[PDB]
Design a protein around this ligand. Structure first.
Ligand code: 017
Lengths: 99, 99
């Protein structure tokens, strides 16, 4: 699809057996969800760094569906006001900026 | 141009008689630069909101050149680690997300 940027680019996600929404965020290196229950192994990751750090759970090679596009990528799980699809997963669906 | 997202989407900016770089950030509503000296009238704006607020100077209808595209939009001036082009100016250059 072609998504214009007059509104926040919020899209429908299937992740961890749940239906979610997330923001397409070209300013974020990483993808972060809260309130998902992912199976499999994880490792702790410190992210952020301003004010302190936040400790999140890093899950590798997570199957995820973004706008009907079934892809795989690293997902961080921790507190976030709006779930965020970062560049690490936008590359997987083939998403570019165009003008 | 078509910009892929394997790297941070940092582009060349002409603003306030200066050459700058800024990140194309679809997760940001607003555009924020530091260390620019913009002419004209401004008004205070509170942005952020997490940890406290940050007070910035809001300048309306600022002429700015983004990748050789000469456009106009609101620019906030305050502290930021990397200058940020938000949706308010990506719409002006006709930038979309595509996949
Ligand atoms: C400015 C970014 C570097 C900050 N981040 C995302 C950012 O886009 C959030 C988006 C966002 C979404 C969910 C959770 C946190 C942050 N919005 C934002 O701060 O935009 C500001 C710049 O212009 C202004 O206009 C509106 C807000 C102002 S960030 O996700 O925390 C981030 C910071 C550093 C890295 N390496 C990777 C990601």
């Amino acid at each position: 699809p072609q998504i214009t940027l007059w509104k926040r680019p919020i899209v429908t996600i299937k992740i961890g057996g749940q239906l979610k929404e997330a923001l397409l965020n070209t300013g974020a290196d990483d993808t972060v969800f809260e309130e998902v229950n992912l199976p499999g192994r994880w490792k702790p990751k410190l992210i952020g760094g301003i004010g302190g750090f936040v400790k999140v759970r890093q899950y590798d090679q997570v199957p995820i569906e973004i706008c009907g596009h079934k892809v795989i990528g690293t997902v961080l799980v921790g507190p976030t006001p709006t779930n965020v699809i970062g560049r690490n997963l936008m590359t997987q669906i083939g998403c570019t900026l165009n003008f």
